[PDB]
Each structure stands twice: as C-alpha cells, then as structure tokens.
C-alpha cells in the first residue's frame, strides 16, 4: 500500500508538522484521541481496536517544543516514544547539531525509522520538514539524511525546507547555516522544495488580508500544500500522480531538484462569495508571481518543468483548456529544450478547511510546483551574504570549537558555486 514517513527536524519542522497533522485528522475523520467514529493508510497506522497512530517522528534537541505536543490536545494521537527529545538545543549552530550533540540522538532516530519501516508494507517516500536557518534543522537534518540514504538506497525523499528571506532574518547565522545545510541537500535528497517566510507573509497580507500574521497562519496553509501534494495516494481521481512520479517529471538533471511552490486559491471567508471560482482563473492565479511561496520573480528566469496538482470538481477538459491559455501568454517563459513542460493531476476530493482557519471552503484547488531557472537568484543572495561574513571570519569560532574546522566552509561554498553555474548553463539557450 501507499506508505510515507514524515520526519520533522528542528522547531520549524515540529511547528509545521503540528499544523500538518492538524489537517490530516480532519480530512480522514480522525478524532484527536485517535479513534475514528482505507484512505488513512498513507499517514496513519491501524492499531488493534479503533486506534490510529501517525507515521511520523517529532525529533528535536530542544525539549520545550516537543513537550508542547506531549501536553497538548494531541497527547493521545502520537506514539509516546516517537516524540524524540534531547537535553539541550543546538543553539543555532550547524557544528553542534551535526557533530557533538546530534550524534547520540540520531542513533535513536534510525531505530525509530526501522520500526516504522517494518510496519509499513511498501514505503514510497520520506517527507522531511526542517529549516536551513537553524542549527538543529540543518546540523541534525543533514545527519539524518546521510544515514537514511545508505540505509534506504534508490528510495525517494522529498525536502520541504524553509530558507531565509532577503529582508527578514530572525537570526544572524542563517547564511552560515543554509550554506552548510545545502551541501547535503544535493546528493542525498531527490526532491527539494524551496520555502520562504516573507513570501508567505506577503500572501497572508494580500490574499488573506490579515494585517499581522503569526507563524500559525503560515503553518496552516503550508499544510494545505503538503496535503494537496499527497492527495493522490489517499484519494483517487482522473489522473493520479505518485510520489515516485514527481522525480521523473521534475528532476531533469541530478543536481537540479529544487522547486518552487504555489497554492493557487487562497481566499478568505467573505471574499469567496463574491469571487467566481473557475478552473481557468485559478490556473491564471497559480502563475501570478505574488502567489509564489518563495520570494522570487519567475519572470527573471525560465520554467524548466511544472506539475499541476488539481483538486476538487475539475473536469479534465477545463485544465486542458487552462493549460493552453497558459502557454499562449508571453509573460511566462519556458526553456527551449522542453516543449512538453506540464504535469497535470486531478483529484476528486476538495480540500477540507479547519474550523477557525483563514482559508474558506473552496470547491476547486490547484497546487503549483515548478522547476525553474529563476531559483538561481535565491541561492545567489545566500551565496553573497555568506561570503561577506566569511571575509572577516565572523561567527567561525563557534563552528571551529565543536568538531568542524575551517576547511568545511570552503567546500560548502564551492559546491554552491557549482550549483550557481549549473542553473546558468542549463537555462542558457543552445
């Protein structure tokens, strides 16, 4: 059966996953204790008599974010010993989370992975949730993905990593942590999905018209992106898209696997009655640059490949009609060597809305994830800011003391240089 294991690393992994698992219970009717009053098999495990346990581990060195789940309203849904904790956090240091304090915890993590892998019959992928800005999500996140690749070869892994914003930075050593984190994201993860905070901040102020959004509002709609992506394994439709289907259609080159994300219909409550929800205009809203979940302009680069995760009552003619109008517009640009650039997937269940959420009930939904050459500027601003602080050797003595030495900054830098020339050479016309 369709089985996926979602690992959650760092505080941003837990907070996104806590909102992600909030949406999963409402879609499949699971009461928060874990008693339902065969779609549950993708994310939940049958357990004895009327009990369902999630196929996830909430691992974080910081105890206070995990302990919120233990004392929260989902104390009985999760397995008590899946929620791996630690003594002290990584203190936003890649060196601590990967070498010193993350070594004794990652061995307990792979023991949890093996028991969850033996329970599932056919495992289809790993959804890793972390942020490259922090020490735990980068240091322990790279450590977890190293052991998972050797333990499980040729098996797909999807990376939903939150990257620093150009204007908003909640910590100082985020450019240092992201460069070290992205060293592992190339050779280990087969699909990486870029995320950014200030872009989702810009969506909430305009589309959701909320004036001061919090992290909870950001986490609730990124959950809708995950649930729209995995909806084909749970709910069937006209054109199903597997998890293993994503790698063949969106990764043309082995080192090119970073993808933007976009959820097209994002409409508040009173807005929806006046708005005409149609297949054509939602597809047009999907490609609109302010609907990107990552702070980037798609007009700067050219689209390499795209996948359209349609949901709800969508006839396959209308998506065929909508895609044709998308190709005709000159405002977007496709790369010259890829005439067949669109993946379409239709699911027949509309996305459920959580009570009290900002999103309103919509009959149709389109999740837009594309591989683009415009993603190169997102790595460039992190590359340039990294070299500014590394020029005068700032915040290095923290990394020097705990395991790492001065060399590993150079190989992490020049691997991003190989990434930067990869996007420019491939996107160039031949």
């Amino acid at each position: 059966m369709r089985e996926v294991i979602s690992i959650h690393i760092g505080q941003a992994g837990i907070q996104v996953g806590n909102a992600c698992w909030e949406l999963y219970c409402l879609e499949h009717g699971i009461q928060p204790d874990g008693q339902m009053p065969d779609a549950f098999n993708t994310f939940f495990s049958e357990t004895g008599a009327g009990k369902h346990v999630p196929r996830c581990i909430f691992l974080d060195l910081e105890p206070t974010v995990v302990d919120e789940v233990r004392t929260g309203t989902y104390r009985q849904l999760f397995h008590p010993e899946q929620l791996i904790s630690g003594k002290e956090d990584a203190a936003n240091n890649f060196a601590r989370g990967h070498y010193t304090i993350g070594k004794e915890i990652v061995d307990l993590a792979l023991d949890r992975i093996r028991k969850l892998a033996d329970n599932c019959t056919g495992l289809q992928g790993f959804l890793v949730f972390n942020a490259v800005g922090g020490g735990t999500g980068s240091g322990l996140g790279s450590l977890l993905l190293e052991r998972l690749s050797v333990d499980y070869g040729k098996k797909s892994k999807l990376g939903f990593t939150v990257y620093p914003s150009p204007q908003v930075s909640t910590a100082v050593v985020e450019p240092y942590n992201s460069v070290l984190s992205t060293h592992s994201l190339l050779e280990h993860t087969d699909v990486a999905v870029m995320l950014d905070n200030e872009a989702i901040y810009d969506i909430c102020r305009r589309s959701l018209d909320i004036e001061r959004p919090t992290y909870t509002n950001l986490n609730r709609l990124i959950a809708q992106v995950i649930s729209s992506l995995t909806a084909s394994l749970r709910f069937d439709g006209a054109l199903n898209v597997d998890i293993t289907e994503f790698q063949t259609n969106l990764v043309p080159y082995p080192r090119i696997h970073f993808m933007l994300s976009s959820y097209a219909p994002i409409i508040s409550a009173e807005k929806a009655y006046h708005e005409q929800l149609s297949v054509a205009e939602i597809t047009n809203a999907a490609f609109e640059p302010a609907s990107m979940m990552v702070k980037c302009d798609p007009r700067h680069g050219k689209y390499m490949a795209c996948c359209l995760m349609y949901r709800g009552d969508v006839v396959p003619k209308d998506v065929n009609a909508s895609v044709a109008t998308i190709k005709t517009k000159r405002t977007i640009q496709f790369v010259d060597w890829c005439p067949t650039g669109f993946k379409c997937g239709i699911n027949y269940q509309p996305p459920t809305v959580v009570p009290g959420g900002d999103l309103a009930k919509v009959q149709r939904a389109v999740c837009m994830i594309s591989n683009s050459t415009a993603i190169g500027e997102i790595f460039s601003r992190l590359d340039h800011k990294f070299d500014l602080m590394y020029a005068k050797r700032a915040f290095v003595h923290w990394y020097v003391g705990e395991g790492m030495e001065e060399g590993e900054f150079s190989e992490a830098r020049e691997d991003l240089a190989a990434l930067e020339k990869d996007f420019e050479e491939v996107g160039a016309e031949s």
């Binding site: 069937d236 439709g237 027949y348 269940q349």
Partner: protein, 45 residues
C-alpha cells in the same frame, strides 16, 4: 480493504454518460452551443 472513492464530478442536468447521446435516447435536451461556441441555449435576450 481498498481506497476512498469520492464522487466523480457531474456538470449539470444529470448527464451520467454518453448513453443517451450514443444510443439515441432522451433527445431534445440542452446543448453547449447552437451558434458561436461561446453562447449557450436559455442564455441571451
């Protein structure tokens, strides 16, 4: 033991399939267009 099957979308008038359209039954129903493809019957002046 299976998969959740949501209802496949039906547009209007309960057209379950091409049974009437092929096998020549239930004639005289509404169509998508009669003139230019944009217009439709019961819509107009």
């Amino acid at each position: 033991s299976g998969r959740l099957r949501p209802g496949s979308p039906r547009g209007a008038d309960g057209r379950n399939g091409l049974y009437g359209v092929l096998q020549m039954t239930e004639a005289g129903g509404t169509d998508s267009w009669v003139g230019h493809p944009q217009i439709d019957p019961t819509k107009g002046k």
